[PDB]
Amino acid sequence: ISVAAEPMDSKMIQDLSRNTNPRKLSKILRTEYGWDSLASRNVWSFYNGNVLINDSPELLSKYKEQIIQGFYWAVKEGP
Amino acid sequence: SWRKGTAFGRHKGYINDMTKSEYHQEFLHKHVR
Amino acid sequence: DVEFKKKIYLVLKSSLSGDEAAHKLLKLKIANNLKKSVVDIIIKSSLQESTFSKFYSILSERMITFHRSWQTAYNETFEQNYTQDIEDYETDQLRILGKFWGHLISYEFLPMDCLKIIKLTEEESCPQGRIFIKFLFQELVNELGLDELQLRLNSSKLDGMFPLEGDAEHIRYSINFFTAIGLGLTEDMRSRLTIIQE
Amino acid sequence: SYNGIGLKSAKGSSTSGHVQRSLASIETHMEKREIEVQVSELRDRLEEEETLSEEQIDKKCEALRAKLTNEWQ
Amino acid sequence: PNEFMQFKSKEVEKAHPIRLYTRYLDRIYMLFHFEEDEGEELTDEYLAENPDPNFENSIGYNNRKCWPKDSRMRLIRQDVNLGRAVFWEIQSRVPTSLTSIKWENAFVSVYSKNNPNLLFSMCGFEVRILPRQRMEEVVSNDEGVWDLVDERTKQRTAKAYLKVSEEEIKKFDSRIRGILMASGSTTFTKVAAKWNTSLISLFTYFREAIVATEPLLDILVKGETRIQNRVKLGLNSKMPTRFPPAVFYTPKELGGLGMISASHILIPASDLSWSKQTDTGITHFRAGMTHEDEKLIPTIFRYITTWENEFLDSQRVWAEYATKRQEAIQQNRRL
């Protein structure tokens, strides 16, 4: 469950702080912010301010909402 | 082991009278030293 | 200058802590043309008493930490005291004055560059001056230990009392002086003199 | 008591209450990521230009992946 | 026989937890030094004989309420259980039919990794000992601190901070109250001489411990105001313009009362929401006894040599006397 962390861009965190399916998101991210295709197609969900990126598809989508609720419970109260 | 040299250790309401009460004795031991 | 000297002295005696006397001196708002004289009143009133008290140290430390001009005044009065006025004083007066400046050097409100002026030889040392250097390093040892005092002496240079280049006789004289004091800070001069004798 | 310093009252202490302020105070991982990116790109391309059927895109993607693997030892 | 708290060797000193002992009139003073083994063994003996899972050992723990909250013993549960184990072992060693060693009159203070202060109150001196390694920044402090020189390596290794104990402050307040009360119809010079007697007896006992003490300075200012109003209500007029400071502190030969001043100082004032938490610096000064004149009346504490500055000098002059006596025996001359 080894996960890295990168900073959000300043323009991207500003555009996300005004709280602004997947093909529209992928096209907007790839043609606006300069994203990888593998990073743009593989996203679980957006809590506000902070994104969750993927890098066995049954084992991924089997606990989709469980990973996303754990992500929510993590970013609500940090380390 | 350090306490076995001595001679002592763990190894070895209400009544109606006011002058005879518990509080009055606590008082007089508080205020005569 | 009697009534201003009286006013400074009664500021120093109508106080309780050194903090309070520092407040009462700094409320007087004395310009630069009398600050050296105020520091001299503080010195000459610390030396009245029988033993040295910490009051004058706490005072002088707050005075130094208030403004740069008081720190320059204490620089100039330490230089003035050692180069001029040690001929005046009794050994008791030099106990008070030596522990005063030792408590000011040990908490680094006076620099080590303020001890730079002392060069102790046979001809430049008063005997009162030697007893004063003894009391300085006695207070410095009792405040700072031997190790931190070695590290502070090795922070900057003191060519006078520690002649690293020096002469074959002044090193031996400083060795015998600092062993008559009883420091144990001697082994660098020992290595240098054993180099020089061969 | 201005700034919470002074007295409750001047009355009681029998002082003036004149409070004054004191003047004394990994490489493998990277490779994997790259591969993923490549795959994504391929997928995008497929989407853009004639790949409504899955088998084609999947095939091409697979091939790409294989190539990537070959490249990285 | 040994001198007071001296030992014949280091091996006899470390052979027992009770390192130092002294007894006053009826106050004992036991300094212990436990290892990690013996302290937790005694603590688990206590917790097996007096169990408390509700952790109410901090409730009712007598703690020095004069020091700030970082200064006195913090109620760390390991050290509170250790201290109650200590007092339980000491309470077990004497029958109650000989003396009533109760917890109420007992102050236990545990220097450890969590409480860097060793507290006691001997002879009216609230002393807080704090090492040079357990302070973050070594700060030169007031006249009321003591420099504890290690007699091994000749270095100042701890700072003992002094305050006057609250019992002795209340006793001094009661003494000035008795000076007021016995002066029914008494001359003004005898009221001044009683104030001088009790003031000298206060400041030549508690010499430097009054700088770091706030209630004693408060009661000094109030009490010297009481003595001045004892003089002025003998004249049925207490106007400040009518009575300068020159009518009280003028000595008894010039015709004045010869009162000794201890209340024309500035009382150190600090934030009384913060002062009961940390060692606040002296950030403000409340005016002690303001007169309309700018008379800087000298105070007695500046003319009394403080105790550390007496005791270092005492060791010096008695070393000089023992050396002169050894020489005069070597010179065979009577000194």
Can you say whether the dihedral through the CA atoms of E16, E22, E27, E33 is positive or negative?
Answer: negative
C-alpha E8: how far from chain center: 31
In the three-class reduction of DSSP (H, G, I as helix; E, B as strand; rest coil), residue E119 is classed as: strand
In this structure, chain A runs to a length of 79
Distance from CA of D8 to the nearest CA of C (A): 22
Q: Does D41 sit within 8 Å of A41, measured CB to CB?
A: no
Chain C residue numbers with beta carbons less than 8 Å from the beta carbon of E296 are 7, 10-11, 13-14, 24
Nearest to D43 by CA among D64, D25, D29: D64
- The answer to whether residues C130 and C120 touch, using CB atoms and an 8 Å cutoff, is yes
Which pair of tokens denotes residue E332?
Answer: 């065979």
Task: Give the containing element (helix H, strand E) for C40.
Answer: helix C35-46
- The answer to whether residues C122 and C159 touch, using CB atoms and an 8 Å cutoff, is no
Please list, in sequence order, all residues whose beta carbon lies within 8 angstroms of the beta carbon of residue C40, skipping any fewer than 6 positions away: C77, C80
Chain B residue numbers with beta carbons less than 8 Å from the beta carbon of E93 are 3, 6, 8-9
Instruction: Report the distance separating Cα E159 and Cα E150, nearest Å.
Output: 11
Q: Does E298 sit within 8 Å of C14, measured CB to CB?
A: yes
Q: Identify the closest residue of chain D to C29 by CA–CA distance.
A: D23
Nearest to C74 by CA among C40, C118, C47: C40
DSSP code at position E259:
P
Q: Are D and A close enough to touch, i.e. 3+ CB pairs under 8 angstroms?
A: yes
Instruction: Report the distance separating Cα A14 and Cα C132, nearest Å.
Output: 69
Distance from CA of E236 to the nearest CA of D (A): 18
In the three-class reduction of DSSP (H, G, I as helix; E, B as strand; rest coil), residue E120 is classed as: strand
Task: Give the containing element (helix H, strand E) for E125.
Answer: strand E125-131
Phi-psi region of E124 (alpha: psi -120 to 50; beta: other; left: phi over 0): left
For tokens 């002044």, name the residue: C170
Chain E residue numbers with beta carbons less than 8 Å from the beta carbon of C55 are 143, 302
For tokens 């009346």, name the residue: E297
Chain D residue numbers with beta carbons less than 8 Å from the beta carbon of A37 are 37, 39-41, 43-44
Instruction: Report the distance separating Cα D10 and Cα E222, nearest Å.
Output: 12
Nearest to A54 by CA among D36, C182, E292: D36
Torsion, Cα C65 C70 C71 C74, to 10 degrees, reads: -130
The answer to whether E45 contacts chain B (CB < 8 Å) is yes
- Whole-angstrom CA distances from D64 to D40, D42, E5 are 11, 8, 86
Instruction: Report the distance separating Cα E13 and Cα E11, nearest Å.
Output: 5
Amino acid at site E311: F
E162 bridge partner residues: E127
E125-131 vs A50-53, strand pairing mode: unpaired
DSSP code at position A8:
P
Distance from CA of E62 to the nearest CA of B (A): 16
- Those residues of chain E whose CB sits closer than 8 Å to some CB in chain D are 218, 221-222, 225, 266-267, 269-273, 281-290
Nearest to C133 by CA among C111, C161, C113, C167: C161
Question: Nearest Cβ partner of E305 from C7, C53, C61?
Answer: C53
Amino acid at site C59: L
Nearest to A70 by CA among A45, A48, A39: A45
In this structure, chain B runs to a length of 33
Please list, in sequence order, all residues whose beta carbon lies within 8 angstroms of the beta carbon of residue E208, skipping any fewer than 6 positions away: E142, E143, E144, E145, E162, E306, E307, E308
Please list, in sequence order, all residues whose beta carbon lies within 8 angstroms of the beta carbon of residue C187, skipping any fewer than 6 positions away: none
DSSP code at position E26:
S
Which pair of tokens denotes residue E100?
Answer: 């009533």
Instruction: Report the distance separating Cα C58 and Cα B10, nearest Å.
Output: 52
Instruction: Report the distance separating Cα E141 and Cα E158, nearest Å.
Output: 12
Method: cryo-EM
Nearest to C128 by CA among C92, C155, C104: C92
In the three-class reduction of DSSP (H, G, I as helix; E, B as strand; rest coil), residue C139 is classed as: helix
Question: Nearest Cβ partner of B3 from E49, E89, E94?
Answer: E89
Best residue of D19, D22, D23 to probe chain C, by most C CBs closer than 10 Å? D23
The answer to whether A30 contacts chain D (CB < 8 Å) is yes
Can you say whether the dihedral through the CA atoms of E135, E138, E141, E146 is positive or negative?
Answer: positive
